[PDB]
Symmetry: C3
Subunit: 193 residues, 3 copies
């Protein structure tokens, strides 16, 4: 079961969840809240490493991640990020989202973007109970044209699903959770497994 729009307006009013800044009524409809693109990005520098050993020694993996991740890219007023075909890039939502322990969220892209090949997640679209922060986007252009991405554009949508009860280990309280406090286009922390 997903919250319908009116109830998404209720839970937000009651402080039962937060979306900050709160999108206006034109962006909350059906069973979703549209979210917008942030202004921070990250690309990959493949020429500095041969591969990433996903569950290899913690040192080697971290040293490798730091080599291949560009610094954070902050776009000027007016400026675009050009996502070319076959290029993976990290980005972030403009909105911070905060979920309570008895709610899980789900990130969709958009059908208009799908029809041009833009994926807004790479089979990871769950926003956990107790989550609090801006959502990091993993963009991939699977289409035939480069796509200019500009801060503020509508980039996806969130839907919300009550859990069967409150989670006993929500994200804000789990010791080995990787992405609390995340505020920009944060790189993989697979090294922390």
């Amino acid at each position: 079961m997903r919250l319908c729009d009116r109830d998404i307006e209720a839970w937000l009013d009651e402080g039962r969840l937060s979306i900050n800044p709160r999108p206006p009524v034109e962006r909350i409809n059906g069973a979703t809240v549209d979210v917008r693109l942030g202004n921070k990005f990250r690309t990959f520098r493949g020429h500095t490493a041969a591969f990433i050993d996903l569950s290899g020694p913690k040192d080697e993996v971290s040293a490798a991640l730091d080599r291949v991740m560009s610094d954070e890219i902050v776009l000027d007023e007016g400026e675009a990020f050009y996502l070319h075909p076959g290029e993976l890039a990290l980005a972030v939502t403009l909105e911070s989202v905060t979920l309570p322990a008895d709610l899980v969220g789900w990130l969709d892209g958009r059908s208009s973007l799908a029809r041009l090949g833009l994926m807004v997640h790479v089979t990871a679209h769950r926003i956990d109970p107790g989550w609090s922060g801006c959502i990091v986007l993993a963009f991939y252009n699977s289409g035939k044209l480069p796509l200019a991405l500009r801060p503020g554009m509508l980039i996806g949508a969130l839907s919300f699903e009550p859990l069967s009860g409150p989670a006993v280990r929500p994200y804000n309280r789990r010791e080995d959770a990787k992405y609390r406090n995340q505020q920009g286009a944060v790189a993989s922390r697979i090294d922390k497994d």
Copy 2:
């Protein structure tokens, strides 16, 4: 919850939910209804533009979309569409689906297709409450072999999820909704943002 098969049917029998043509009992099972491939398609003509400015002047964006989108391709009797690796294409379901205001739908592909790299959407698989029309598919072949797609084949599945209450702004009543009355392989309408 999602509706189980008997409850999917019950909803079809009451007429709230509607699928046209209605698939037989052999294609409604577990918590899904199988859907089939239509006969309309669209490809991209990248050579006529440099890029698409997703958030750029409305006039630029439409003019560019019209140049890159092919003529609808209509396949007659057992003609195939050849989806080659790395090629994004648009297609449609054979079935029209109509949802009421208190229900949201979700499009899956198929495991058998996944194992050959066929994606049936590009992180956009929500069918909204109030939606009424054929579903546009954004195909991408991520595998190593070209795949021949024929009309009538089983291409995906739908599951259905009651909302917490009836949506106040369902898709059929919302004024800036892009894809009401969708009956073929309709191209992106990101220009109408």
Copy 3:
């Protein structure tokens, strides 16, 4: 509605849902159970066929699938599977999952893996009511770096959703279901449509 962590443990304790071997308490949190990577894999040999006719004559599609699928790869001690960008591969979960008729499951990847371009499904991530078996993974590396995959690593997550009632035609009792008794990195069986 998804089961929260305490409710997942309760259903495991009841036994009609089951995950063998059962992951410890550290791996069940929020609304998910983490799953791990198994030791069996498959690649494609494209050089033996021109294409696969998804709904062409049964005997010629079974012949083509047998020619393009490698036999099963079983990795030796401390050995890795190297997933190069743009290469599709099949794998399997370490865990066997068994769901009852009144429950559907959903496979996520991981945000840490998404941020390096690793997809763990190809728009097919529904685990059906009545399902029983190891889950076959369709991996694709959409990133810039090859990724070394080692058995035992955390590869994804499962969430669980009660159905409106028990399915009348769950997966275990359905005569044209393709993937019961599924043990390794089983190849597409699209030829059985």
